Design a protein around this ligand. Structure first.
Ligand SMILES: O=C(NCc1cc(Br)cc(Br)c1OC(=O)c1ccccc1[N+](=O)[O-])c1ccccc1[N+](=O)[O-]
Ligand SMILES: O=C(NCc1cc(Br)cc(Br)c1OC(=O)c1ccccc1[N+](=O)[O-])c1ccccc1[N+](=O)[O-]
Lengths: 166, 166
């Protein structure tokens, strides 16, 4: 992990930094990731610094549909530093049910979101999806790597904020 | 931990919350802790929300000496989400060397500080000291529990910011 952080901090450009983070996540056993960050006091989700390997058409759809206002992980991240797991119980409204269906069609069904709150008031999220047979298999896998992920999200924040905002 | 967080969340009052947090830290191997928190935009360290079992006379000395302006972990917390270990190299200035000697006289020599950055702009620290026979032993110990501490500091923040300011 630490060696990954140092690779990130010796990277040059967004592409390489993204490559490194994606590989860290893959090596931990996640398949798709999205790292997003906004500067202090922005709610301009449509212009967030976004890194990762979510399907492009899914990212486009999310922006067009204004899903930042629906996605239950977004409001969660504005209120908490703790992880939110992608459990059925987080999708409550009608729009949130539509979101779950559309994300699932994108292959994003099992996963979690770690909120990011930076030392300079950056607001973000590190979302990570996992391929599994069922939700129970996914949840066992996630619980097994959670301590590593918990450290990773802060390493990714510290490094990524520098990249994003300078 | 999660059960520990749930206890914190069910607790009534600062006394019970502090006891639970102190017990969690003690159980992990740390004998003295300080959890400190300031609300959004405050730099009023003399009036921070403070929990823990540092010696009273040390807390009083820190406040009277204005050590929040000296303590290298404070500047670090304003710049980072990553831990800072209490290594001799972090004490650079003359006043910082005095700080190191005075803390060590309080029994606070080996340890680390986890920066706290809350979802509503809260700024703080969770500082933990370890009773060890020497720094090398202390560092072996802290490395061995770091991933648990890294989750703990966020549970403490999430719970403690509510206790402090809600
Ligand atoms: O990853 C999920 N949500 C976060 C997210 C996805 C997309 Br696509 C685009 C954005 Br913008 C996005 O939101 C963020 O990254 C975000 C979230 C919170 C704060 C700040 C940011 N920020 O800086 O922009 C998600 C969560 C649960 C289930 C499915 C998904 N999903 O998108 O497939
Ligand atoms: O614990 C250390 N520093 C933090 C600290 C100690 C005392 Br006593 C009083 C305060 Br105020 C304090 O500062 C904080 O808690 C703090 C730190 C950063 C941001 C916000 C806060 N905030 O909200 O108060 C420390 C660090 C390294 C070595 C020794 C020590 N030590 O004090 O024994």
């Amino acid at each position: 992990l630490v060696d990954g952080f140092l690779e990130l901090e010796r990277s040059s450009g967004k592409l390489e930094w993204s490559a490194i983070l994606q590989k860290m996540a893959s090596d931990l056993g996640f398949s798709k990731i999205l790292f997003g960050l906004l500067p202090k006091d922005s709610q301009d989700y449509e212009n967030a610094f976004i890194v990762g390997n979510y399907p492009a058409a899914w990212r486009e759809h999310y922006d067009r549909a204004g899903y930042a206002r629906v996605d239950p992980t977004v409001s969660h991240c504005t209120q908490s530093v703790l992880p939110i797991f992608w459990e059925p119980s987080i999708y409550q409204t009608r729009k949130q049910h539509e979101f779950f269906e559309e994300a699932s069609a994108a292959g994003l069904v099992y996963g979690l979101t770690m909120p990011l709150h930076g030392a300079r008031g950056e607001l973000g999220a590190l979302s990570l999806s996992v391929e599994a047979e069922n939700r129970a298999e996914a949840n066992r896998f996630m619980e097994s790597v959670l301590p590593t992920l918990w450290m990773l999200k802060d390493y990714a924040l510290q490094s990524g904020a520098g990249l994003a905002f300078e």
